[PDB]
Curated annotation (Swiss-Prot), chain A:
Designated name of the protein: Splicing factor U2AF 65 kDa subunit
RRM domain residues: 7-89, 97-174
Higher taxonomy: Eukaryota, Metazoa, Chordata, Craniata, Vertebrata
GO cellular component, as recorded: commitment complex; nuclear speck; nucleoplasm; nucleus; spliceosomal complex; U2-type prespliceosome; U2AF complex
5-hydroxylysine found at: K114
Key words of the record: Acetylation, Disease variant, Hydroxylation, Intellectual disability, Isopeptide bond, mRNA processing, mRNA splicing, Nucleus, Phosphoprotein, Repeat, Repressor, RNA-binding, Spliceosome, Ubl conjugation
Portion of the parent chain present: 148 to 336 of 475
Length: 174, 172
């Protein structure tokens, strides 16, 4: 981004032979029947198809409607479960999905704590808070996953779970 | 999706020409209001006089469907038989193959050379990272003869391709 790609969605696994027009009517219709539309008129302004690789990019009129349409991820359209994602170029703003990791054993080093988190997917940021005078760990860390949907799954996979004699706390750092 | 724009027509009268057949279906289509638009829906007609049938080729899928309603229509005194082509796919794309776990160093031709050993292809693509040009290690295809799809799966799926084990299946 940082602000680029705000009003477009990738749509994967589109039906064979489908038209930009039918795609448009379909997503326009869903936005309306789902009550995700936030004003009179069509939220999707345009649809670009790559017939060869079977995906499309939707172009929305507004920022929030782009986000809401993500709730259609999975929707079946002519027998086909659509894969709806953000454009590759789209980034959330830094520390939007920053995580707190509490209840880590204090003898474990950076790489060793990273291991637990890297399990769920790659990180764009991480820091295990230490006592700088000694170098010894305080038992808590912060991180951010590169893919951003990974954030919730790491919480579900770690929050409240057991790690030694301690119980891990994983949550949005705000 | 090219067989969705053709129709078999049987019981054609002796001596009829490809043009005259063309005229008649265009006329019928105009008459009903079964056309998608201005112009002629039938682009071409091929006639086998020895076996007394023809193929019509239409400009659109929806207009091809519409012309099926003309089954039994009278043409120069005789009742025409109108049917789908034997290889018409009602559920289009159903034989598109996904091909996964390809050595990532293999190019378009090489993967095609793997696949074509079962027959000619009508569609193919190997997915690549736009940034680099590097294969992501999977491809898609569809055979010219769809009755070979299952053969290609039977032959390729689970074959060891040096370093990797191939996943070959309908892309569904």
């Amino acid at each position: 981004g940082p602000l680029g790609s705000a009003r477009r969605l990738y749509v994967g696994n589109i039906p064979f032979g489908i038209t930009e027009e039918a795609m448009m009517d379909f997503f326009n219709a869903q936005m309306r029947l789902g009550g995700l539309t936030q004003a009179p008129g069509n939220p999707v302004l345009a649809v670009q198809i790559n017939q060869d690789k079977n995906f499309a990019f939707l172009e929305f009129r507004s920022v929030d409607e782009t986000t809401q349409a993500m709730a259609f991820d999975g929707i079946i359209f002519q027998g086909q479960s659509l894969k709806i994602r953000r454009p590759h170029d789209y980034q959330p703003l830094p520390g939007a999905h920053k995580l707190f990791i509490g209840g880590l054993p204090n003898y474990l080093n950076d790489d060793q704590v990273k291991e637990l988190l890297t399990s769920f997917g790659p990180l764009k940021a991480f820091n295990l808070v230490k006592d700088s005078a000694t170098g010894l760990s305080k038992g808590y860390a912060f991180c951010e996953y590169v893919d951003i949907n990974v954030t919730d799954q790491a919480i579900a996979g770690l929050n409240g779970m057991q790690l030694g004699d301690k119980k891990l706390l994983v949550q949005r750092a705000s």
